[model samples]
Target: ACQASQLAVCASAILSGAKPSGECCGNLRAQQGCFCQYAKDPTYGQYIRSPHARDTLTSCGLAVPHC
Candidate 1:
């Protein structure tokens, strides 16, 4: 089963006011399909919509989807 924590490996960077790392971009790419679902989750939704998170997506060459 897919896990949000698996993709949250970048939390320290994206959520801590730091830039996303190479590894973080990798994980984010791997979890690309899960973004919308995560945005729908009350617990994790806000983070998914955060400026840092959006920056991470852009840095990783990913387009932030409308959810």
Candidate 2:
């Protein structure tokens, strides 16, 4: 099952623009399919679209969720 909590690895990077760690990238890939669902979450979505988050995902070669 997809768990947003697993993505905690990316906390500092996604929230504060720090470079994402290798563990963060790994978890992002693991949660790839859940991105859209997470994007629809009010608590999570805001960070999903944050500038640092966008940079984090892109730098990891991930496509940001459209939803």
Candidate 3:
């Protein structure tokens, strides 16, 4: 699924203080809906511990779903 890729990209943007485009936000929301599944993916798992990633989640008002 493109969910992880889009979510990472959106998170990066959020952390970078770059405006997240509407499309990016849409993808972020879509990925967030499947949070549990994404959390289990090893490739994306490392992102949760990332300060950049955490900041983005905070900026988006999203709490990291337990892996």
Candidate 4:
């Protein structure tokens, strides 16, 4: 199960279309295991699949969930 609240640190960067900050990256790393769950969420799936999100995660050295 994914703790969606854990993702709050990434909201600004994710929704603002801005480069992810260190805080965002930190949260991202913390939630790396939840990426698969996020990808399946109707409310968050699209956002997680967005190119900006992809680029941001990649830039932070995180891998996007393929599932």
- TM-score winner among the candidates? 2
lDDT of 3 by residue, 1-67 (tens): 4454766656655455565444544555666556645666676566555555555555666446664
Off by over 4 Å in 4: none
TM-score of 3: 0.51
* Candidate 4 residue lDDT tens string, 1-45: 566776676676678766666655556566677766666777886
TM-score: model 4 vs. ground truth: 0.67
Q: What ranges in model 3 sit over 4 Å off? A: 11-26
Listed in order, each prediction's TM-score against the native is 0.68, 0.71, 0.51, 0.67
**What is the lDDT for 32 in model 3?**
57
Candidate 1 regions exceeding 4 Å error are: none
Put down candidate 1 lDDT per residue, 1-67, tens digits, no spaces.
Answer: 3456756677876567766676766675566677645666678766776777777777777556665
TM-score-superior candidate, 3 or 4: 4
Candidates 1 and 2, the one with greater lDDT:
2
- If candidate 1 were superposed on the true structure by all CA atoms, what would the RMSD be? 2.2
Against the unseen true structure, what C-alpha lDDT does each candidate score?
A: 0.67, 0.70, 0.57, 0.67
lDDT winner between candidates 2 and 4: 2
lDDT of 2 by residue, 18-64 (tens): 67666665676776777656777777766777777766666777656
